[PDB]
Design brief:
Belongs to the integrin alpha chain family. This is Integrin alpha-M. It is found in: Cell membrane; Membrane raft. By secondary structure, the protein is of the alpha/beta class. The chain has a single domain, classed as Rossmann fold (3-Layer(aba) Sandwich), CATH 3.40.50. Strands 3-2-1-4-5-6 form a 6-stranded mixed β-sheet, with helices on both faces. It starts with a strand and ends with a helix. The structure holds Simvastatin acid and magnesium ion (MG).
Length: 184
């Protein structure tokens, strides 16, 4: 009943310690939701974009370790808004294994410093709402330490922000998603 896509920040500002933590966060969400009706898909972005697995590819090989282990960090600039547009148009496409009546969830993992993107969040967030995608944001590094990055996380997340913005250092986001999925 639910299709969950990950969009993870592989840009130069993300230190390898945090990138590693993104990989274990994503893997743990998948591992915890195994034996459920959830499909998973993941894109890494910087100034380039890498689909590491589609929903269909997860369905054919639902092994979180096998799917996430070979992921290496892109480095480069931070095109978060374009990444969101590509997730919506490509990952949640039926050609890639996305399902018609599935509950759509996007989990964006970033430090909240979009940089060099020709697109603004105003260019892509409406499209995300148009396709019914629920957006959770997982902050990393110093995302919560300045007002600019805090507000950027809020801008990406579905409303209200306090229900959709979380940290990579814990699994509160997973608890919330599990609760949402249970209720739904
Ligand atoms: C891009 C060519 C340019 C501007 C001439 C240059 O000399 O560029 C330097 C100077 C500085 C002002 C701005 C830069 C922008 C991108 C380059 C990866 C580089 C490193 C800063 C960058 O690593 C900061 C991270 O935040 C990247 C990201 O995560 O988006 C850095
Ligand atoms: Mg960056």
């Amino acid at each position: 009943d639910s299709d969950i896509a990950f969009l993870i920040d592989g840009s130069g500002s993300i230190i390898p310690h945090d990138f590693r933590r993104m990989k274990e966060f994503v893997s743990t969400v998948m591992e915890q939701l195994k034996k459920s009706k959830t499909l998973f898909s993941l894109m890494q972005y910087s100034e380039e974009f890498r689909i590491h697995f589609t929903f269909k590819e997860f369905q054919n090989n639902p092994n979180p370790r096998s799917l996430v282990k070979p992921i290496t960090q892109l480095l480069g600039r931070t095109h978060t808004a374009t990444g969101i547009r590509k997730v919506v148009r490509e990952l949640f496409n039926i050609t890639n294994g996305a399902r018609k009546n599935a509950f759509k969830i996007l989990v964006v993992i970033t430090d909240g410093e979009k940089f060099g993107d020709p697109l603004g969040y105003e260019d892509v967030i409406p499209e995300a709402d148009r396709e019914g995608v629920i957006r959770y944001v997982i902050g990393v590094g110093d995302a919560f330490r300045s007002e600019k990055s805090r507000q950027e996380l809020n801008t990406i997340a579905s409303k209200p922000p306090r229900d959709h913005v979380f940290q990579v250092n814990n699994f509160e986001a997973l608890k919330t998603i599990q609760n949402q999925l249970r209720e739904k």
